[PDB]
Amino acid sequence: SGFRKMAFPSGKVEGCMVQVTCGTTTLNGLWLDDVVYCPRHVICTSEDMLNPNYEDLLIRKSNHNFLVQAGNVQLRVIGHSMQNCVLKLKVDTANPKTPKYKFVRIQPGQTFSVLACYNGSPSGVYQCAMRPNFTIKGSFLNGSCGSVGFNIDYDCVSFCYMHHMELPTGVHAGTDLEGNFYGPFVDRQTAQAAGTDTTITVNVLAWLYAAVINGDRWFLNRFTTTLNDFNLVAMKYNYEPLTQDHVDILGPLSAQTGIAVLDMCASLKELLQNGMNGRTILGSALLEDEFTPFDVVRQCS
Amino acid sequence: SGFRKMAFPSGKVEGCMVQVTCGTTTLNGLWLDDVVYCPRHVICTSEDMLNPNYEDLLIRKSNHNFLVQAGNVQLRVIGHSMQNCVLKLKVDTANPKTPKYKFVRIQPGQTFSVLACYNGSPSGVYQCAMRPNFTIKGSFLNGSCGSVGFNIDYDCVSFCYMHHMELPTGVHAGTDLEGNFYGPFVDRQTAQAAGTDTTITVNVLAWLYAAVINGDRWFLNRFTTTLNDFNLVAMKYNYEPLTQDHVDILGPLSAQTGIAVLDMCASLKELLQNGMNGRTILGSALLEDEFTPFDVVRQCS
Numbered sequence: 071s072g073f074r075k076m077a078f079p080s081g082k083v084e085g086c087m088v089q090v091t092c093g094t095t096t097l098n099g100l101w102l103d104d105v106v107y108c109p110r111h112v113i114c115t116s117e118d119m120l121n122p123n124y125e126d127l128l129i130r131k132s133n134h135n136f137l138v139q140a141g142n143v144q145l146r147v148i149g150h151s152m153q154n155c156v157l158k159l160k161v162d163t164a165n166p167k168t169p170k171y172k173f174v175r176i177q178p179g180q181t182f183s184v185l186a187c188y189n190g191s192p193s194g195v196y197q198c199a200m201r202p203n204f205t206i207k208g209s210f211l212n213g214s215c216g217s218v219g220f221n222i223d224y225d226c227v228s229f230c231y232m233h234h235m236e237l238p239t240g241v242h243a244g245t246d247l248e249g250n251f252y253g254p255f256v257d258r259q260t261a262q263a264a265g266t267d268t269t270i271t272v273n274v275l276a277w278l279y280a281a282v283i284n285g286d287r288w289f290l291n292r293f294t295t296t297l298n299d300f301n302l303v304a305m306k307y308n309y310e311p312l313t314q315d316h317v318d319i320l321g322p323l324s325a326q327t328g329i330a331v332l333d334m335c336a337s338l339k340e341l342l343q344n345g346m347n348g349r350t351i352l353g354s355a356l357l358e359d360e361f362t363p364f365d366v367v368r369q370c371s
Numbered sequence: 372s373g374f375r376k377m378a379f380p381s382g383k384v385e386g387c388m389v390q391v392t393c394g395t396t397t398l399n400g401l402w403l404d405d406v407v408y409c410p411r412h413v414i415c416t417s418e419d420m421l422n423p424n425y426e427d428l429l430i431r432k433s434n435h436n437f438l439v440q441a442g443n444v445q446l447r448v449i450g451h452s453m454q455n456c457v458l459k460l461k462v463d464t465a466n467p468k469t470p471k472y473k474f475v476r477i478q479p480g481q482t483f484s485v486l487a488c489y490n491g492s493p494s495g496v497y498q499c500a501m502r503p504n505f506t507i508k509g510s511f512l513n514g515s516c517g518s519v520g521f522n523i524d525y526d527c528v529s530f531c532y533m534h535h536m537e538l539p540t541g542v543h544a545g546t547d548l549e550g551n552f553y554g555p556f557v558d559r560q561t562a563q564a565a566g567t568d569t570t571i572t573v574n575v576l577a578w579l580y581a582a583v584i585n586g587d588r589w590f591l592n593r594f595t596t597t598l599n600d601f602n603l604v605a606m607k608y609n610y611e612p613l614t615q616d617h618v619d620i621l622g623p624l625s626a627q628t629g630i631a632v633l634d635m636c637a638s639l640k641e642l643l644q645n646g647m648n649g650r651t652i653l654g655s656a657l658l659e660d661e662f663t664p665f666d667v668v669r670q671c672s
């Protein structure tokens with residue numbers, strides 16, 4: 071037992087991280103087969119960052135302007151092209167450590183692991199949720215761009231995120247691996263705002279089930295609510311509506327604990343209205359929404 | 372910016388994980404050079420688990436009784452020996468993926484990454500602190516024994532923990548890699564209690580500095596306290612005494628923020644006496660003590 075925020079093992083992704091330099095800008099790239107993927111803003115300069123024309127900037131580049139380093143070995147760039155907000159650098163060597171992989175785009179409310187990297191060297195791994203407002207609450211410093219987010223299923227790495235920028239509020243924005251931004255963000259040197267965020271209700275309920283499985287039961291009660299009466303309370307506290315699909319997704323956890331989803335919903339209503347009265351749930355004094363039902367089943371089955 | 376619980380990249384340790392089976396018990400082992408390390412309780416049975424004589428149990432074993440599997444390859448055991456509560460299985464092949472490593476024992480209050488593994492296959496990575504009472508609050512299921520904890524410095528893996536057991540309270544106990552338990556625990560099938568725990572004061576202060584660096588300032592005040600007056604409050608709330616060495620260790624963070632350690636101590640006193648009044652610090656509604664000063668400097672420099 072126990073319940074911890076838990077990342078996927080990062081080895082398969084570590085073997086794909088390289089350093090990419092253009093001019094005086096260094097960031098990370100992802101080396102899969104004979105292509106290195108990185109943020110296109112590597113080609114921007116201080117003179118042209120407020121609103122770059124990236125098409126013009128790339129036309130003016132040559133292969134030799136890109137310095138790609140895999141550990142202590144320079145990789146020769148033999149082609150370059152733009153893919154939305156990502157650059158694809160074709161190199162003369164296929165990465166021998168290329169895992170089985172896919173490029174997936176994730177939905178708000180889903181989680182993934184981030185391998186934070188600097189100068190092409192992995193520094194740390196943590197778990198993040200894609201927020202309803204298409205930001206992530208990460209931990210990224212200067213030089214972290216090109217760090218990626220991923221999930222692993224069997225032996226296959228599903229890449230879902232590449233890091234591009236930090237918003238004024240200190241949250242993070244980036245793209246899928248096709249170079250399409252999550253959310254209404256653009257890769258220029260401007261202060262941009264995310265939409266209003268909301269709490270991921272289905273995840274809060276999953277975490278409450280995790281708590282029960284781990285022996286935290288104080289917040290349980292004999293009451294049940296209707297889906298509609300619950301959603302009335304949800305709206306009031308800036309929680310997303312709970313749907314029948316969510317109820318279905320929570321089915322395994324409901325079966326394991328013997329607590330119906332609408333029974334647990336009555337607990338959540340009570341916690342929203344009354345707070346915790348000095349108590350904690352799984353070591354937290356607030357309601358946690360960055361664990362999916364899948365994440366819970368992984369540690370609690 | 373941002374501040375997340377962050378594990379070390381796990382690749383170097385992933386390349387060392389194997390499966391060890393004796394009889395009907397399967398758990399994990401750590402394969403370094405030509406030795407596999409695992410918990411000695413792999414040789415216990417349901418008939419003899421309340422209080423095994425491990426010396427007798429090992430005398431009755433042969434090399435062929437140990438089945439060691441590295442991925443899809445059986446490793447031939449050519450020697451076996453006991454090292455306190457660890458078994459050392461000499462194998463006929465040196466692990467080609469052996470990193471530079473050390474076996475260190477850690478102190479209470481220090482952190483490390485855990486690579487949770489089942490059937491010799493890495494499942495997840497998370498960060499833990501060694502508690503004052505020599506337990507860890509981990510996430511471990513049946514089959515997780517032999518999973519290891521570690522820190523990485525440059526290219527060198529410092530192994531500090533191997534997992535052996537779960538206490539009745541749901542916290543975890545294990546050994547260093549020399550097979551010596553952390554705390555007053557023994558590897559038998561009995562319910563054992565840890566000593567009373569305490570809060571790691573120096574870590575709480577480090578995390579408060581992290582918060583300031585990340586723009587959380589509401590808990591700051593114009594007051595300073597003496598070390599002795601602070602320790603009077605610490606004792607009252609089951610916090611460890613703060614020492615001058617701790618003040619010194621916090622020096623870089625104090626310099627970075629311009630807030631003297633004894634200034635921050637006045638904030639901590641106020642938070643202990645008054646609570647947060649509905650507010651949060653770095654996304655938490657309680658005071659967090661599982662980040663060391665080093666951990667903070669890593670994400671906040």
Ligand SMILES: *[C@H](O)[C@H](C[C@@H]1CCNC1=O)NC(=O)[C@@H]1CC(C)(C)CN1C(=O)c1cc2ccccc2[nH]1
Pocket residue numbers: 097111114119210211212213214215216234235236237238242256257258259260261262372
């Ligand atoms: C890439 O390494 C870097 C990562 C940032 C640095 C600090 N923490 C991070 O996550 N990205 C950037 O610096 C990106 C590149 C640009 C898209 C060109 C701009 N940028 C921003 O993060 C950026 C610029 C800017 C201006 C005003 C307010 C916020 C703001 N963010």
Ligand SMILES: *[C@H](O)[C@H](C[C@@H]1CCNC1=O)NC(=O)[C@@H]1CC(C)(C)CN1C(=O)c1cc2ccccc2[nH]1
Pocket residue numbers: 071398412415420511512513514515516517535536537538539543557558559560561562563
């Ligand atoms: C090893 O895979 C396993 C890991 C446990 C299983 C559940 N979560 C974990 O962390 N270890 C054990 O099962 C160890 C082996 C023994 C030392 C022989 C006993 N054991 C315990 O964890 C254990 C036995 C026992 C009895 C009564 C109360 C608690 C208790 N823990």
Ligand code: NA
Pocket residue numbers: 290291292293294332333334336337
């Ligand atoms: Na109920």
Ligand code: NA
Pocket residue numbers: 591592593594595633634635637638
């Ligand atoms: Na103060």
